[PDB]
């Protein structure tokens, strides 16, 4: 875990997540997908404490999938994010809290709008045009403050995202082994295979 | 050991009747007559003090009870059931309202809490329903004066005026003739005493009659001074002397 980014553009949400899984002085894996599909038009990336991250992501995934079957209906990204926030808000005052930070990128089909939510392990939710967790934000936020425009296309968003990854590869101390990029739009979730 | 009665003692009969509630209402019918009348500037609740023995001190037995400074209650039916309901009703006014909002509950909501308690005795395991009907008179800032009846089922209805118990049928007919929407509190007390004389058989005086009002604030009954917003209880129990004064001009 470490680097997870998110950029909401005109018609889609783009999530970039690092592929490295390090433990100690050994990179154990360099092709790790730090995300789960909660519903056809909702994707959650995650980063934080080992074990907690996946255990939490899959637990949320199961709950959202259960809801979808029960009601034969997809929950809005706003509704999913509120559910997730509450779960983390409970967790922080538990015996052992989930130390997991998440980004929830989704496309609201009723509004026909992309939505990006940033939620930390405390249960601190915010809707944003672009978001990041961990040390990544210290570089990407200022970069996006400058280069981001709200009416950008998905292709412009990917070029904007490349600019972030390049900066991180240049100035970050650790080798995060590149990123897996995924796009959430009206047609659902798809992965960019060449980044 | 332990309460093995975890099942309902009140159940539906083939005809759709809830037997124990019906029988509880029968117990209320046998009970002594009590009544309540709502005026424009107050409410009056009254009942006969049926003495079990002339050696018994009927002052020690209070059929009319203060629940909050602005709410009072009277009953017809089984006295012991009433007594515990008053205890629970007083406590619930604090636990479920005053300790949360820092003020006393309005009449309708306290009534609602009492109704809930009586409804649970109709459905919970190993209990019979309460064998009483309550008349709860009260005042609050946003609803003004109000009068409620609460039956063994847990149902409650707001009334302009009503009677319950022994001679309720005749007493209700009497109240229909006398009641209007322009009654002043003193006129309602007068009618209450007239209505109650019909049902009472033996002695009729301030010692055999129990009567309380929900009227103006009573700063003299507050017990302290210095807080302007605190003006005193609207509930006041009429004294044995105060009743006899009105019985002369009857």
């Amino acid at each position: 875990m470490d680097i997870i980014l998110g950029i909401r553009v005109q018609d889609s949400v783009i999530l970039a997540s690092s592929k490295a899984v390090t433990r100690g002085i050994s990179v154990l894996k360099d092709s790790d997908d730090k995300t789960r599909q909660l519903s056809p038009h909702t994707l959650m990336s995650f980063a934080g404490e080992a074990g907690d991250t996946v255990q939490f992501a899959e637990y949320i995934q199961a709950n959202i999938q259960l809801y979808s079957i029960r009601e034969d209906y997809e929950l809005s990204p706003q509704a999913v994010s509120s559910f997730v926030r509450q779960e983390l808000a409970k967790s922080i005052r538990s015996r052992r809290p989930y130390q997991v930070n998440v980004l929830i990128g989704g496309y609201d089909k009723k509004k026909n709008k992309p939505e990006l939510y940033q939620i930390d392990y405390l249960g601190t939710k915010v809707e944003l045009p672009y978001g990041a967790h961990g040390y990544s934000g210290f570089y990407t936020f200022s970069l996006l403050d400058h280069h981001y425009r709200p009416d950008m296309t998905t292709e412009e968003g990917l070029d904007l995202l490349k600019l972030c990854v390049q900066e991180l590869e240049k100035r970050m101390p650790m080798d995060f082994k590149g990123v897996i990029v995924k796009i959430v739009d009206k047609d659902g979730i798809r992965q960019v295979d060449d980044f | 050991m332990t309460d093995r009665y975890s099942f309902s003692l009140t159940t539906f009969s083939p005809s759709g009747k809830l037997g124990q509630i019906d029988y509880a209402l029968t117990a209320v019918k046998q009970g002594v007559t009590s009544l309540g009348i709502k005026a424009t500037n107050g409410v009056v609740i009254a009942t006969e003090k049926k003495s079990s023995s002339p050696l018994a001190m009927s002052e020690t037995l209070s059929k009319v009870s203060l629940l909050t400074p602005d709410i009072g209650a009277v009953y017809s039916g089984m006295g012991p059931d009433y007594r515990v309901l008053v205890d629970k009703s007083r406590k619930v006014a604090h636990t479920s309202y005053k300790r949360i909002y820092g003020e006393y509950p309005p009449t309708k909501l306290l009534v609602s809490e009492v109704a809930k308690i009586m409804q649970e005795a109709t459905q919970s395991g190993g209990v019979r329903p309460f064998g009483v009907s309550l008349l709860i008179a009260g005042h609050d800032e946003f609803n003004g004066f109000s009068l409620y009846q609460v039956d063994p089922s847990g149902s409650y209805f707001p009334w302009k005026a009503t009677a319950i118990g022994k001679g309720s049928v005749a007493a209700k007919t009497f109240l229909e003739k006398r009641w209007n929407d322009e009654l002043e509190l003193e006129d309602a007390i007068h009618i209450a005493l007239l209505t109650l004389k019909e049902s009472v058989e033996g002695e009729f005086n301030g010692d055999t009659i129990e009567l309380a009002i929900i009227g103006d604030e009573n700063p003299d009954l507050l017990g302290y001074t210095g807080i302007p917003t605190d003006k005193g209880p609207r509930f006041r129990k009429l004294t044995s002397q105060e009743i006899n004064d009105r019985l002369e001009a009857l």
């Binding site: 009601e71 209906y73 929950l75 809005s76 706003q78 509704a79 509120s82 559910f83 509450q86 009723k110 | 093995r4 009665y5 975890s6 099942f7 309902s8 003692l9 009140t10 159940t11 539906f12 009969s13 083939p14 005809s15 759709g16 009747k17 809830l18 709502k38 309708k108 609602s112 109704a115 809930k116 009586m118 409804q119 109709t122 459905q123 919970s124 395991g125 190993g126 609803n143 109000s146 009068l147 089922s153 847990g154 149902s155 409650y156 209805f157 707001p158 009334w159 302009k160 005026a161 009503t162 209700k172 109240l175 229909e176 009641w179």
Partner: protein, 244 residues
């Protein structure tokens, strides 16, 4: 032991019926009639108060029609005390959903959960069922205007127009006769009152023996308004349709 006095409220008859559920329905059949009619631009709830006394305070009274949230209301038929237990649960369930998802609860979800509670009392616990039938009138952005009913069995169904309580057989025949799909709210208001007026056990239908409510989109632009009718408003609507 205590076995001797157990009624066994949650068992089957030889015919495969639930005694207590059947007897609870028999109880509800004597309760004041309640009618729900769903129009294309709103829903009407109409209910007859149980034999009113002239000294009953009519304006500050609530017997039949209750508000669950801003978008959903219910009409009650049966034991009022039982209904209020279930209503407070339903009100809480609605707020739990809003707190969790930051969205108002879909009508069916609320109805299902309340019906699931009733179901539980028929299968386990050894307690008597709730002697209550609801008519749920509500709106959400998925299905729009919806009418449901639930009964002591915990079984619920959706309706265009429906009655519960007394004389449902006669009331349902009259609704089935005059109802049509392109109906407006003001027409549904008239149908509801006309049906009660004919099926009533009373001599004549008056304002003091009725509770009335509408759920329209008659507010300002794309939002729903609940209107629990005042006594004077029922008096006017009763004159306007020519019943009194």
């Amino acid at each position: 032991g205590s076995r001797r006095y157990d009624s066994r409220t949650t068992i089957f008859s030889p015919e495969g019926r639930l005694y207590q559920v059947e007897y609870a329905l028999e109880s509800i059949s004597h309760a004041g009639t309640a009618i729900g009619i769903m129009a294309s631009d709103g829903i009407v709830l109409a209910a007859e108060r149980k034999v009113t006394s002239t000294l009953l305070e009519q304006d500050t009274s609530t017997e039949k029609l209750y508000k669950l949230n801003d978008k959903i209301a219910v009409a009650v038929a049966g034991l009022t005390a039982d209904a209020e237990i279930l209503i407070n649960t339903a009100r809480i369930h609605a707020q739990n959903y809003l707190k969790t998802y930051n969205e108002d609860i879909p009508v069916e979800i609320l109805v299902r959960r309340l019906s699931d509670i009733k179901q539980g009392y028929t299968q386990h616990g050894g307690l008597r069922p709730f002697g209550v039938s609801f008519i749920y009138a509500g709106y959400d952005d998925r299905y729009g205007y919806q009418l449901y009913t639930s009964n002591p069995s915990g079984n619920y169904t959706g309706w265009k127009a429906i009655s519960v309580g007394a004389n449902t057989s006669a009331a349902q025949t009259l609704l089935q006769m005059d109802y049509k799909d392109d109906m407006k709210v003001d027409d549904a208001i008239e149908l509801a009152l006309k049906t009660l007026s004919k099926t009533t056990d009373s001599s004549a239908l008056t304002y003091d023996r009725l509770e009335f409510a509408t759920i329209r989109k008659g507010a300002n632009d794309g939002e729903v308004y609940q209107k629990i009718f005042k006594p004077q408003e029922i008096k006017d609507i009763l004159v306007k349709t020519g019943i009194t």
